[PDB]
């Protein structure tokens, strides 16, 4: 069963006993999921339960070497989508991607790694466009980074709140 | 009685970072050196790496010479499995060969999967360099690597 990882996480994150909800604490810190992917098309969802004033979230995929005490997308090992302004971050460079997301939004994360690799983000089921093309080769994990005490909840499947239309994938729960 | 092997092994993982260190060796290049006295028969370090089927060694060796890597870090478990530490491994990559080794390798069974673990053949004291007999298959006169282990009873070649 796929959860938020037990040790592979910044220790200041407040993770709930279910291992599916996480609260932030101070500066950007990361948590990865227990399972990762190396080939194929995979999907998972994140719900922003609570985003108080002056809180942000950068969500997406990370290789095992992504820095735990830094925002997702800080280095070459991760690609992220920022709640503030919808910016996309990779190697600490943020570029125009989409509109921002906030409290209550259910966000979608699609990756494709064929044996042409793609990262696509979803906002309440709607395709937000391709964010990254021909990404680095490696194992990619679902990952959450939070800047202060926001709360988000991750859903690996099997059933998603807003299954994207005409997209082929397997839920991350298949990994467990 | 004895400790259950999987407990021995976790203890190994937790402590081996603190007992061993990588330095330059008089034997060759770099090696693994004992940092605190290890008693005989104790686990020293696992030969960590990528576990592949035996049929994949010859393909990987050829692509390793396409990259010009000089030494081979593949270490055989049994007839059907080999640990490939060339691109993924731990400090055990640096354990040099000797003909009077203070360590030996043996295969262990932990939860169905198999590991290669380096055991202290004797009581090893701090400052010593850790070595084991590579036991390369003998080859012919060509492709023959001389052995500089400094042992009084050196075989004069690794293979």
């Amino acid at each position: 069963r796929v959860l938020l990882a037990l040790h592979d996480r910044a220790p200041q994150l407040k993770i709930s006993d279910d291992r599916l909800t996480v609260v932030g604490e101070k500066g950007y810190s990361m948590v990865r999921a227990s399972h990762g992917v190396r080939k194929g098309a995979w999907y998972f969802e994140i719900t922003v339960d609570e985003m108080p004033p002056d809180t942000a979230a950068r969500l997406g995929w990370s290789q095992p070497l992504g820095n735990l005490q830094a925002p997702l997308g800080y280095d070459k090992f991760s690609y992220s989508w920022r709640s503030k302004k919808g910016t996309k971050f990779h190697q600490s460079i943020g570029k125009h991607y989409s509109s921002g997301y906030g409290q209550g939004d259910v966000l979608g994360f699609y990756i494709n790694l064929p044996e042409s690799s793609e990262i696509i983000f979803y906002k309440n089921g709607v395709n937000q466009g391709v964010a990254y093309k021909d990404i680095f080769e490696g194992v990619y994990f679902p990952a959450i980074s939070l800047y202060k005490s926001c709360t988000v909840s991750i859903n690996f499947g099997p059933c998603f709140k807003y299954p994207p239309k005409d997209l082929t994938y397997r839920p991350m729960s298949d990994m467990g | 009685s004895d400790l259950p092997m999987p407990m021995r092994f976790r203890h190994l993982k937790k402590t081996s970072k603190e007992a061993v260190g990588v330095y330059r060796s008089p034997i060759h290049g770099r090696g693994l050196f004992c940092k605190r006295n290890i008693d005989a028969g104790e686990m020293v370090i696992e030969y960590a790496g990528i576990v592949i089927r035996s049929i994949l060694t010859d393909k990987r060796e050829k692509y390793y010479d396409s990259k010009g890597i000089g030494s081979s870090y593949m270490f055989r478990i049994d007839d059907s499995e080999v640990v490939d530490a060339t691109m993924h491994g731990n400090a055990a990559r640096f354990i040099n060969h000797s003909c009077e080794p203070n360590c030996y390798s043996r295969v262990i069974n932990i939860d169905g999967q198999k590991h290669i673990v380096i055991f202290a053949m004797r009581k090893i004291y701090r400052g010593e360099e850790l070595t084991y007999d590579y036991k390369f298959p003998i080859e012919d006169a060509s492709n023959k690597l001389p052995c500089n282990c400094g042992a009084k009873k050196c075989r004069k070649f690794l293979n």
């Binding site: - | 990528i50 576990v51 870090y73 691109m87 731990n90 999967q113």
Partner: peptide
């Protein structure tokens, strides 16, 4: 090389032996 602490088991792809 990339430093590692536990053994990883190589997962072969379907086309592992193909030209």
């Amino acid at each position: 090389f990339k430093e590692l602490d536990e053994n990883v088991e190589y997962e072969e792809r379907e086309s592992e032996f193909d030209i």
